[PDB]
Paper text:
Here, we report 11 lineages of V2 apex–neutralizing antibodies from simian-human immunodeficiency virus (SHIV)-infected rhesus macaques and determine cryo-EM structures for 9. Envelope complex structures revealed eight different antibody classes (one multi-donor) and the complete repertoire of all five possible recognition topologies, recapitulating canonical human modes of apex insertion and C-strand hydrogen bonding.
The four new lineages each interacted with conserved cationic amino acids from all three protomers lining the trimer apex hole, most commonly through electrostatic interactions with Env residues 166 and 169. Each lineage recognized two or more apical glycans from multiple protomers, resulting in 41–55% of their respective interactive surface areas being contributed by glycan interfaces. The penetrance of these needle-like HCDR3s into the trimer hole to recognize Env residues 166 and 169 was consistent with mutations at these positions to confer complete loss of neutralization sensitivity.
Numbering used by the authors:
A (entry chain L): 1 to 27, 27A, 27B, 27C, 27D, 27E, 28 to 107
B (entry chain H): 1 to 52, 52A, 52B, 53, 56 to 82, 82A, 82B, 82C, ...
C (entry chain X), E (entry chain Y), G (entry chain Z): 520 to 545, 568 to 664
D (entry chain A): 33 to 57, 66 to 136, 151 to 184, 187 to 309, 312 to 323, 323A, 324 to 396, 405, ...
F (entry chain B): 33 to 57, 66 to 135, 149 to 185, 189 to 309, 312 to 323, 323A, 324 to 396, 405, ...
H (entry chain C): 33 to 57, 66 to 135, 149 to 185, 187 to 309, 312 to 323, 323A, 324 to 397, 406, ...
The structure:
């Protein structure tokens, strides 16, 4: 299976500054044709997860634009210009490039 | 907005078996492919199986010779069946599916478009392998 | 009088109104239809005066020939035919002998042309 | 002795057929093809002449029908077609009969890369269920219909037929002509009188009245399948009009192409109908049965019944005026029996119509602004005789249809084309000299 | 001389130059119009031939009849009509009564033809 | 006494219309369609004869017009239709002393219906309008045009009209012909001479030159609404060219049909124009004003201004050269006043044309590779006189933009069709021998 | 015999069956073709009839003239020409001057008609 | 003292160009409009008459070619065009020892323009091309031209057609036996209407054609020239039996509002290669007679060899047929595989192709729909179209191969017995006549 690692395990910042998180994979996720299926998921406490970014950088309708991501090859990360109260929740990284799917252990993002 | 329906939940004894199910409605869904992932208690998610309902199947590491899957189109649902449960199987099941809702169905050959659907997430089954 | 002004009258008098009849002888789909009718009438008029030309009465309405009349065709008296019978009934009476008359007329005309040519050759 | 004589230009004719050319004075019945007619009628009476007439085997109706079909096609072809209109329709019931359906559907606009949502009203007879909400235009599963081209109209302009050179037309001037029989009084004219090409079924409108009494025509009354034609001796006024005046909407389906749909209705919706004087109709039927008794005998019971069955074209009465095509239920005019202040007939409207019952040649009729009134009078009928093996002394008749040729056969029966034979021979005591 | 070359010349040249004129009398859109023109010319020629034939002058360029002249039609001397006048002026002057001459010629032709037929019948 | 006679084949003619036909030696006017004309036509000259001519009411011009538009439609029928070209066009500018040319792009189909392709093409501002950056084609809301096939060319092959048997064409060879009235010197020809069906407004290209000097012909000199024709006795050479080197690229619009679009422009971009020497034009205008004074009298000054106003085609000189339809502003030439180096004409190109001033048959001429450069002979003008008041001791003239009837009439002014009447009657001292 | 039966026989015997030969002279894809063929045949017949009429025959199948036969056209006597020679090679023999022969015929007929009119006018 | 005389109606005819009209007793040629011909085609002999016939330069061949093309284009005009058939086709092999038939699935419109419909149809390999176990394919006519389909109501039976000359013209029939192409016919006759000519369609061979009355004949401008085809006529026809036991299923699909399309459904039973049979002994005897005549023309002690086609397009290098609705294409290499010096049957493999361009034109093809049940195409060969190579200086041995390329040769082999001549009933001759004033 294509296992992947997340970083940082835990994080917590006060509103007013940007934030970032990264999730690396064991090997390149690019398939034969060239497309990528890197997905970013957010799961607030008490409710199921919700996606924010698709194919490394694209944004899903309903997601705030302040959320953006990029990457290439094996290194990928998410960048947010401003964190709000609604952003509090559990953050996940995911990829479906290969049949055996793997999801990160999960990172905590607390706000004062 | 697209919706998902979770069914087939219940309590199973160690090494027993049960029947799982899920459904979706509210749109056409076009080329939609259902998934199955569970979150262990206190640990991250983990893939279970796969069913390409509309349009090929894929099974995880610890589900061979234990889970058999099926698809539906009249209802767009999928029929899952497991056997030989274990203590590690105790986890919340979420109906994962890659949504692709079509939009403005092309009435000619100059208007075809697709909404680029969303990955619907199921509420949760909370399957426990105990008495 | 006019066209067919004496068609039903006696044949003798009706024979004097032949000039009126003689004078009366003359998108893409509609165009071809009109052209078809016109050429049909013209072709019929050429066939007619061609039948007159092959005989000894070219360019003439009333005309007699040298073919003797046969009683088999009709043995009626000369008084009623020229004063009682009409052209319609008379034509219907010899509707089957029309071809024989034309053939005999043609043969007689050809013989007459050959005879006059030979006569004028030595004259 | 005697000798044969050749005579040219003899007045002899015989039965034959030929392609007659049209002739007349914004109409599908007349164009540049028809040449001008002679104002002076060159009619010549034929004395002592008697010729047999057969209006049933005559080829006049065949040629007329063929030329009219060609004219109809040549008239509908020059402009826009409605092939893209075959799409799904979303209809909702109207609310100030209960027939008109407010349908809406997607349709392209000036640019082939865009769409414009439009709505129009269509009668129940012009649509069919796919479900209760979805609808599809009738005849879409057979062919693509064509809209009545707006420049031309359906005014029945008179048409005069003139035989070409070498041919002649005999007119039966004698009265009481029963269709198939000798005509003692005959006349010849190079051009027939005015003929109305008005299309209709069951009843004959804007025709020619009889001479002095009601007429009855048929191949031979001792039959059932063959139709029977009746001509009235006096005119019977009839009125028809729809109080609803539709609103035309200009919708463009392509470059230089646009169809006129039915807009919202103004006022109240009332079903179309027709009116006829009850007294005149009763008197006409009395005269018709009186004449029929001559052939069927006296002390006989004559009854009238509506159409038995079939499509709407044969089971209803059609019209042609102002661009609107009607289909009325005339069951009220054939619901009387005989021994020894107005009538109203319900009617319906239909746009898609198979005029000459040709499968795959449907035509779309666009509406017309303002109310439309068509004043006219009936002149004849097309009935069908039915009955048993003379077990009862009651005769029943029903209106007929389908045979479009029978509609116009009641007008061309007064003419017959013949081929002149200017060549003739006769005996005389004349011999050519050298 | 060429065709229509004697239009303005004296009657002498025109009377002796009628042979040339007589011989001169005889994508789908092009074919249709050309066929229509050809049929029109043929019909005109047949009409002229019929008019000449009815007057007992078929196939004759010049033909004399037994119809006397009228001073009303022409109130001028014959000499100038022949050696001092063109066909254009003559036709322009005779156009007033050109239609009635045909009827008189037709009547005279029919009368003489019937008389000839009777004479041949007696013999 | 005197007796009448019948003459056959007499020389007589009368005014009457007839169905004329062509005669000639990959083109709109098919040369093979016309019957092969006589290589050496026989022209017979008459004598002692006069005839009246009316070049205004003449029917040959009407026949020419009908035939030209009929052939135009016939030639455009087999070419492909541009119905799918109506699509939204996101367009920008081109980067020149002009910005009119536009570089537009748009989605379009390919050989496969399901598949689609993105292509670009250059278009002029004269046939492009903003739908709301977004542009479309003006022809979309009028009718679908049909691009002229590359095989068919607009070259003006001369056509020799000829009359059928029984008719004759009278040619008026009299010099300084007044246009209408008796012609003391006429001639007869079996078929007309070479006539080039060149289409042009205001200025006449490749026309016929006069004999002695400049002639003036008009229906009524005293009438201002009616146009006034002019014909020069000497030719005024005019050079028109397109310095832009166009590139043609084929695009598969559909199965078996290709679309010719303007590839691109290589090198510098310059405006199209025409050149005419001012000395020759000055002399020609001097002679023209002298001839005008001959009719308007002495001591009268004349002015020459630009077009009064109206559409682009009617207010500008329009002509074709190698397939490209030009539209030049002739205001500079018609700018002078008469009392008692070469000029450059700013010209623009138009790809969408509506020849014959009729809607529903628009054209989309394709581009031509290389540099277009053609020479032409200016032989006539179409002037128009504005309303006056007591003549104001001066008259103003403008270049009229009438239809092509005047253009074709300027060449057929010396022709007329007549019907022969070989039947004649005259008296003679003769008696038909019995 | 049938049509063209005497094609190979001598001209003397073939002249006895000339009338049969003279008589035989008389949706859109085929319609246009048939109309064109009929019009062409009619035009040919009219042209031939016009030639005969202008030559003085005016319908007479066997007609002679007053134009001497120049020996330059053919140095063959009447002996073998009317005994065994057919019409094919004969046509070939005069195929070099038939135009001159026609011209002479015309002029001769025109002069004859003019002389006849003059003589009849004197008396 | 001889005087010229004018005669009319004399027997004189000259070769000239003219137009003819149809005559016979629905079909693509629409014989219903042909004027009916009399039931007695009267024929008159011409004793002591000899005429030169040049069938190679005859104009009736061009007239027939143009007329047939016009009828073919007119009959297919009202039929339903298949412009929307050009779409992306996803085909797969049909499961059976050919690997040629493909099962294609594609999208199509229906009665309503706002909704599509998924359907499938079998297409032969010759009707599809690769455009880069399933792949995308495209029809060969998409990048060339979108043509219509032959309406099933119309048939392709080669019914005979009679050509009758118009008024003022005549047709001369050369009945002389052993009469080659260009030469004087000792015995000629005249007929108002030609015999029933079947407008058959074939390549490299003649089917249902005329048969020689005496023996095999060879016709050509000059056999020495290799640029001229060689026409052969057999005095004894050889039977040929073609068929395809497949039992194709017809699938009616309404592509539009009234536009019906006939697709190829699933095959019933087992798929068998389309082949044709012909007797071997008869073919050997016919070849023997042909080589005998060829030796007589080229000289004695000459080696004659028969080889297959020299390559080219499938239309010219194969054998074209017209029966059942479709057009077969057989590989005739099995016949011209022998050399001549001094119960058995042969099987000819054949293929199937719906889209055709038999007229060799560019821009107008034809879609032939299939038919139900087995097809039994029974016919007999009557002629051959052979071509010979230069051979260099080597003249002791010659090789002949099937020709093709000019469709006029098919009908030319049937029109060699007729010619068009313009009647000239005007003549002048001298006589002792003198008119009397
Ligand atoms: C003319 O053309 C227009 C083009 O837009 C058509 O309009 C669309 O028509 C389709 C027809 O199916 C509509 O489709 C239906 O949409 C429902 C809701 O979707 C909209 O709303 C949600 C939010 O609530 C958005 O996320 C989404 O993007 C849409 O905007 C769905 O619920 C429907 O699916 C359900 O019902 C159907 C019923 O058949 C079932 O089959 C499904 O399984 C499911 O249960 C369906 O997808 C679409 O919404 C229309 N949108 C518009 C107006 O743009 C017109 O219909 C057409 N002509 C006319 C007049 O009808
Ligand atoms: C050579 O002549 C033979 C014999 O006429 C032709 O065979 C016939 O061909 C036709 C098609 O052209 C076959 O038609 C079909 O017949 C069936 C049965 O009648 C009918 O149901 C179909 O609708 C259709 O008409 C016909 O059966 C067939 N006859 C035989 C005995 O095989 C042959 O086609 C001719 N050659 C060529 C090249 O066409
Ligand atoms: C007829 O149309 C007018 C508008 O032109 C409308 O006001 C009127 O009410 C309509 N007729 C009826 C009966 O509603
Ligand atoms: C002349 O006539 C004789 C028979 O009379 C014939 O044998 C001879 O060939 C003829 N000669 C010519 C030159 O015609």
């Amino acid at each position: 299976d294509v296992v992947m690692t997340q970083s940082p395990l835990s994080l917590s910042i006060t509103p007013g500054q940007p934030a970032s998180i990264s999730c690396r994979s064991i090997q390149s996720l690019l398939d034969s044709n060239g497309k990528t299926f890197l997905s970013w998921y957010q799961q607030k406490p008490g409710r199921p997860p919700r996606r924010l970014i698709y194919e490394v950088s694209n944004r899903d309708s309903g997601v705030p634009d302040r959320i953006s991501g990029s990457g290439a090859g094996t290194d990928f990360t998410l960048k947010i210009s401003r964190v709000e109260a609604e952003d509090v929740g559990i953050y996940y990284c995911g990829q479906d490039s290969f049949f055996p799917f793997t999801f990160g252990p999960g990172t905590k993002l607390d706000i004062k | 907005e697209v919706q998902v329906v979770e069914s087939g939940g219940g309590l199973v004894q160690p090494g027993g078996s049960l029947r799982l199910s899920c459904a979706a409605s509210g749109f056409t869904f076009s080329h939609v492919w259902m998934n199955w992932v569970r979150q262990a208690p206190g640990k991250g998610l983990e893939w279970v199986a796969r069913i390409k309902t509309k349009g090929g199947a894929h099974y995880a590491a610890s589900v061979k010779d234990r889970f058999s899957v099926s698809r539906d189109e009249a209802k767009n649902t999928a029929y899952l069946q497991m056997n030989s449960l274990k203590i590690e199987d105790t986890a919340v099941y979420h109906c994962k599916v890659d949504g692709s809702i079509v939009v403005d169905e092309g009435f000619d050959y100059y208007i075809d478009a697709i909404e680029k659907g969303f990955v619907v997430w199921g509420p949760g089954v909370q399957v426990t392998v105990s008495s | 009088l006019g066209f067919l002004g004496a068609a039903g009258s006696t044949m003798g008098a009706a024979s004097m109104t032949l000039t009126v009849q003689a004078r009366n002888l003359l998108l893409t789909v509609w165009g071809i239809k009109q052209l078809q009718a016109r050429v049909l009438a013209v072709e019929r008029y050429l066939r007619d005066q061609q039948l007159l030309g092959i005989w000894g009465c070219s360019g003439k309405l009333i005309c007699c020939t040298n073919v003797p009349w046969n009683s088999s065709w009709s043995n009626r008296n000369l008084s009623e035919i020229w004063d009682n019978m009409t052209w319609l009934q008379w034509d219907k009476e010899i509707s089957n002998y029309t071809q024989i008359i034309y053939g005999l007329l043609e043969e007689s005309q050809n013989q007459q042309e050959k005879n006059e040519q030979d006569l004028l050759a030595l004259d | 002795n005697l000798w044969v004589t050749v005579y040219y230009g003899v007045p002899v004719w015989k039965d034959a057929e030929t392609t007659l050319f049209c002739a007349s004075d914004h109409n599908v019945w007349a164009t540049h093809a028809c040449v001008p007619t002679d104002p002076n009628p060159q009619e010549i009476h034929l004395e002592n002449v008697t010729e047999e007439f057969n209006m049933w085997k005559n080829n006049m109706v065949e040629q007329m029908h063929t030329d009219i079909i060609s004219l109809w096609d040549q008239s509908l072809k020059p402009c826009v077609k409605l092939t893209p209109l075959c799409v799904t329709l979303q209809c909702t019931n109207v609310t100030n009969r209960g027939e008109l359906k407010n349908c809406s559907f997607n349709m392209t606009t000036e640019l082939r890369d865009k769409k414009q949502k439009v709505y129009s009203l269509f009668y129940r007879l012009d649509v069919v269920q796919i479900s209760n909400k979805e609808y599809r235009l009738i005849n879409c599963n057979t062919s693509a219909c064509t809209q009545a081209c707006p420049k031309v109209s359906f005014e029945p302009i008179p048409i005069h037929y003139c035989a070409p050179a070498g041919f002649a037309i005999l007119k039966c001037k004698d009265k009481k002509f029963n269709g198939t029989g000798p005509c003692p009084s005959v006349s010849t004219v190079q051009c027939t009188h005015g003929i109305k090409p008005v299309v209709s079924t069951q009843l004959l409108l804007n025709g020619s009245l009889a001479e002095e009494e009601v007429m009855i025509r048929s191949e031979n009354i001792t039959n059932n399948a063959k139709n029977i034609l009746v001509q009235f001796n006096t005119p019977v006024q009839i009125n028809c009009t729809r109080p609803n005046n539709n609103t035309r909407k200009s919708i463009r389906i392509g470059p230089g192409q646009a169809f006129y749909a039915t807009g919202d209705i103004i006022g109240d919706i009332r079903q179309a109908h027709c009116n006829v004087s009850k007294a005149t109709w009763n008197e006409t039927l009395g005269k018709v049965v009186k004449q029929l008794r001559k052939h069927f005998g006296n002390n006989t019971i004559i009854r009238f019944a509506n159409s038995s069955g079939g499509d709407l074209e044969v089971t209803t009465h059609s019209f042609n005026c102002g661009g609107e095509f009607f289909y009325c239920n005339t069951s009220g005019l054939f619901n009387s029996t005989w021994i020894s202040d107005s009538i109203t007939l319900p009617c319906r409207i239909k746009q898609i119509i198979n005029m000459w019952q040709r499968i795959g040649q449907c035509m779309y009729a666009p509406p017309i602004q303002g109310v439309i009134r068509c004043v006219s009078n009936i002149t004849g009928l097309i009935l069908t005789r039915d009955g048993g093996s003379t077990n009862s002394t009651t005769e029943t008749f029903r209106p007929g249809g389908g045979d479009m040729r029978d509609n116009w056969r009641s007008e061309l029966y007064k003419y017959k084309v013949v081929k002149i034979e200017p060549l003739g021979v006769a005996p005389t005591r004349c011999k050519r000299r050298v």
